[PDB]
Amino acid sequence: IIIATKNGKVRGMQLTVFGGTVTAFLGIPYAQPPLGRLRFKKPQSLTKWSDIWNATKYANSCCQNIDQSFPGFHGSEMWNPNTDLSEDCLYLNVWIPAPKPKNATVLIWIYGGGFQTGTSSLHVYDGKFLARVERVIVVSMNYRVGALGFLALPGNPEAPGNMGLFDQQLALQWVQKNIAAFGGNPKSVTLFGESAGAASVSLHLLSPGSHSLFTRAILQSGSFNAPWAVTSLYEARNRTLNLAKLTGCSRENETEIIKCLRNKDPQEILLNEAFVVPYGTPLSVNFGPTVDGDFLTDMPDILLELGQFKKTQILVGVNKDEGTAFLVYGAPGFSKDNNSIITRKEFQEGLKIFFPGVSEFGKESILFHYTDWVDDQRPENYREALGDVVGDYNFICPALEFTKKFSEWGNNAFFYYFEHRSSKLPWPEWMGVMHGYEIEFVFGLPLERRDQYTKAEEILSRSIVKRWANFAKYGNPQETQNQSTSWPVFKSTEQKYLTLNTESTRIMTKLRAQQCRFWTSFFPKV
Ligand SMILES: *[C@@H]1O[C@H](CO[C@@]2(C)OC[C@@H](O)[C@H](O)[C@@H]2O)[C@@H](O[C@@H]2O[C@H](CO)[C@@H](O)[C@H](O)[C@H]2NC(C)=O)[C@H](O)[C@H]1NC(C)=O
Ligand SMILES: Cc1nccn1Cc1cn(CC[C@@H](NC(=O)/C=N/O)c2ccccc2)nn1
Ligand SMILES: *[C@@H]1O[C@H](CO[C@@H]2O[C@@H](C)[C@@H](O)[C@@H](O)[C@@H]2O)[C@@H](O)[C@H](O)[C@H]1NC(C)=O
Ligand SMILES: *[C@@H]1O[C@H](CO[C@@H]2O[C@@H](C)[C@@H](O)[C@@H](O)[C@@H]2O)[C@@H](O)[C@H](O)[C@H]1NC(C)=O
Ligand SMILES: *[C@@H]1O[C@H](CO)[C@@H](O)[C@H](O)[C@H]1NC(C)=O
Ligand SMILES: *[C@@H]1O[C@H](CO)[C@@H](O)[C@H](O)[C@H]1NC(C)=O
Ligand SMILES: *[C@@H]1O[C@H](CO)[C@@H](O)[C@H](O)[C@H]1NC(C)=O
């Protein structure tokens, strides 16, 4: 009930799940808190301790702005942090099966949130189900987000960039050294994450420093080749002094600007984060990953293209309606509380919001490819098209392109297409299979029959959880036991993928091929 780790002793708690027991260790520090002088830099090696650490409650979530666009609405507030914010938040959690296993595959979860938001404490990231049902060990970590986590003055150790990534990377180091004591196999570790998480997983495949800290990887609706994924060094620095002039820390010795930025309280930094870009976007990663030359050694699309990544198996996938989520965060004519039937002109205005610094002709090219309908007169035509535009551009096509490029170097890759809409999904129906709403299925939440899900959803989650575990333990995401569809490898030529839903799981080819050729061949040119 007490575990001796390589820098201290931690105590956990016992949880009853499905007439079994799961040991949960909630909130174990992995770094010296990045407060004071340590704000904005790489996380520092946590020195030894003496007590029995009481890891029996989630720790602090890292400082972050809150989605306040729908106060009181579960669909949005579901994602807001559910513990205190604090700069002192570099902690992690561990779920082990009871009784303590021997050489258990380990699953490491990295949340999303546009690199600005998110926390591990979330209800839909609970690792107790996965530990119970599949007797794997689940770990998840809080990493720094927003400018506290990704402010970049390239070169400068006082703020080199990618700090939240190095946070994450330090937590994988912790699992390498400490997960044995918990009964886990450091030689069998599978990273998985969602959106910004999924982009972080793909970045750990590129970053040489991470290659020895995990074996396989799962990417849910995100990859580093996504347009929001990597910030340039050009706009990163523009973004820091714009935050400095906003805080009156405009100096000229770059190191002395940082010192100024550290005696500002975290709330002042959070407030000015928004105004740092002139024309924001619902998917505006104001502070995210950069080519720091330490974690990320080159421009990732080059590393990708030239095969400069950890060779192993990937599991990649996306949801049917990735883009709808964002239309109600600004796009004109859209709301969660009506059917959001927009016209042609509301559509065009919606393009300027999603593509503000894009040529008049560039916006026109999008309108051309998505508004030559399979048939006109349909009133949702414009509403559905803008949803798909955001989805295909921001998630679906980069995921697929990443998987093609990765598979081309000889590794097994598996691609899925999640198309079930949660019966408990709080948002309306036109928004479809929303971005993010597979996570509860992956984590085994429909398995609690007390949780209002339909029986079909329990079956689907069950199969997904098995597939995810089999990929984790055996590099192969099959469900061998029940007479279910086998999941074929994604080859660059044939491009097969597996659909996931309650009805049937069919095997299809070349998802969104026409839409993706536009986005990946003739649209990067504008
Ligand atoms: C769908 O609703 C939006 C906005 O509206 C609602 C649901 O919430 C906010 C309230 O202020 C609204 O009264 C309503 O309760 C509608 O968008 C508005 O549409 C008006 C007419 O087209 C315009 O004058 C407004 O500028 C515009 N506002 C925004 C923010 O877009 C939209 O018309 C509704 N759609 C349908 C089909 O009814
Ligand atoms: C983790 C996750 N998985 C699926 C969905 N979510 C959360 C989410 C919320 N949103 C929409 C607005 C939101 N923007 C971003 O979080 C960045 N996106 O790139 C925000 C708005 C205002 C302040 C701070 C953040 N989009 N996703
Ligand atoms: C850490 O926890 C110790 C034990 O906690 C108590 O006993 C266990 C068996 C549970 O029943 C738990 O709910 C109880 O609170 C304490 O004795 C100790 O003081 C704690 N130390 C710190 C620093 O909090
Ligand atoms: C760089 O930043 C310039 C300044 O932006 C303006 O001032 C800051 C403080 C914010 O309030 C912002 O909203 C303002 O627009 C921009 O003028 C410039 O375009 C940016 N980009 C480049 C390449 O210089
Ligand atoms: C766990 O499995 C790995 C696989 O190579 C093996 O090397 C290691 O010795 C095993 N350890 C235990 C405790 O089973
Ligand atoms: C900036 O200030 C720091 C601290 O005073 C100093 O070490 C460094 O040499 C200065 N750099 C320049 C270019 O003046
Ligand atoms: C396989 O089907 C049985 C019912 O015949 C069910 O109880 C079991 O949970 C299923 N297993 C998986 C992994 O879906």
Rounded to whole angstroms, how far apart are CA atoms 111 and 304? 23
Q: Which two tokens stand for residue 310?
A: 């950890």
How buried is 142 (Cβ within 10 angstroms: 0-12 exposed, 13-18 middle, 19+ buried)? buried
CA-proximal residue: ligand 1, atom 5 (nearest): 335
Experimental technique of record: X-ray
Pocket test for ligand 6, best of 252, 255, 260 (most atoms within 8 A of CB): 255
- Which domains does the chain carry? 1-526 (3.40.50.1820)
333 lines ligand 1 (CB under 6 A): yes
Q: In Å, what is the CA distance from 62 to each residue of 164, 183, 325? A: 10, 29, 24
Number of other CB atoms surrounding residue 263 within 10 Å: 9
Rounded to whole angstroms, how far apart are CA atoms 416 and 250? 48
The answer to whether residues 427 and 335 touch, using CB atoms and an 8 Å cutoff, is: no
Query: Do the annotations mark residue 109 as ligand-binding?
Result: no
Residues 6+ apart with CB under 8 A from 287: 115, 116, 145, 146, 147, 149, 150, 151, 152, 231, 239, 273, 276
* Closest alpha carbon to 2 in 20, 18, 19, 23: 23
Atom of ligand 2 nearest to the CA of 64: 24
Q: Is the dihedral of CA 433, 437, 438, 444 positive or negative?
A: negative
**Bridge partner residues of 453 (DSSP):** none
Atom of ligand 4 nearest to the CA of 234: 23
Backbone φ and ψ for 365, nearest 5 degrees, come out as -60, -40
Backbone φ and ψ for 186, nearest 5 degrees, come out as -60, -25
Q: In Å, what is the CA distance from 52 to each residue of 2, 11, 24? A: 8, 7, 15
Query: Is 435 in the active site?
Result: yes
Of the residues 121, 204, 435, 463, only one is catalytic, namely 435
Rounded to whole angstroms, how far apart are CA atoms 449 and 458? 8
| Ligand 6 center–CA 145 separation, angstroms | 28
Residues 6+ apart with CB under 8 A from 353: 281, 282, 330, 331, 332
The answer to whether residues 287 and 239 touch, using CB atoms and an 8 Å cutoff, is: yes
CA-proximal residue: ligand 5, atom 11 (nearest): 103
| Ligand 1 center–CA 333 separation, angstroms | 6
Give, in degrees to the nearest 5, the angle at Cα 383 between 377 and 387: 135
467 lines ligand 7 (CB under 6 A): no
Backbone φ and ψ for 169, nearest 5 degrees, come out as -65, -35
| Closest-approaching ligand to the CA atom of 185 | 5
| Ligand 7 center–CA 18 separation, angstroms | 15
Of the residues 61, 76, 121, 195, only one is catalytic, namely 195
Rounded to whole angstroms, how far apart are CA atoms 91 and 148? 16
Q: After which residues, if any, is the chain broken (C to N > 2.5 Å)?
A: none
Number of other CB atoms surrounding residue 408 within 10 Å: 15
Q: Is the dihedral of CA 191, 195, 199, 200 positive or negative?
A: negative
Sequence letter at residue 372: D
The answer to whether residues 326 and 434 touch, using CB atoms and an 8 Å cutoff, is: no
| Ligand 2 center–CA 113 separation, angstroms | 5
Q: Which two tokens stand for residue 1?
A: 């009930």
Token pair 């129906």: residue: 429
434-437 long-range contacts, CB within 8 A, separation 24+: 434/319, 434/321, 434/324, 434/325, 435/195, 435/221, 435/319, 435/321, 435/322, 435/323, 435/324, 435/325, 435/326, 435/391, 435/395, 436/79, 436/112, 436/194, 436/195, 436/221, 436/319, 436/325, 437/319
Rounded to whole angstroms, how far apart are CA atoms 359 and 366? 11
Query: Is 195 in the active site?
Result: yes
Query: Do the annotations mark residue 79 as ligand-binding?
Result: yes
Pocket test for ligand 7, best of 130, 133, 462 (most atoms within 8 A of CB): 462
CA-proximal residue: ligand 5, atom 12 (nearest): 103
| Ligand 1 center–CA 428 separation, angstroms | 16
Sequence letter at residue 426: P
Query: Is 207 in the active site?
Result: no
DSSP for 2-15 reads: EEEETTEEEE-EEE
SS3 429: coil
Q: Which two tokens stand for residue 413?
A: 């890759």
The answer to whether residues 131 and 212 touch, using CB atoms and an 8 Å cutoff, is: no
Token pair 């309606």: residue: 321
Query: Do the annotations mark residue 420 as ligand-binding?
Result: no
Rounded to whole angstroms, how far apart are CA atoms 235 and 97? 46
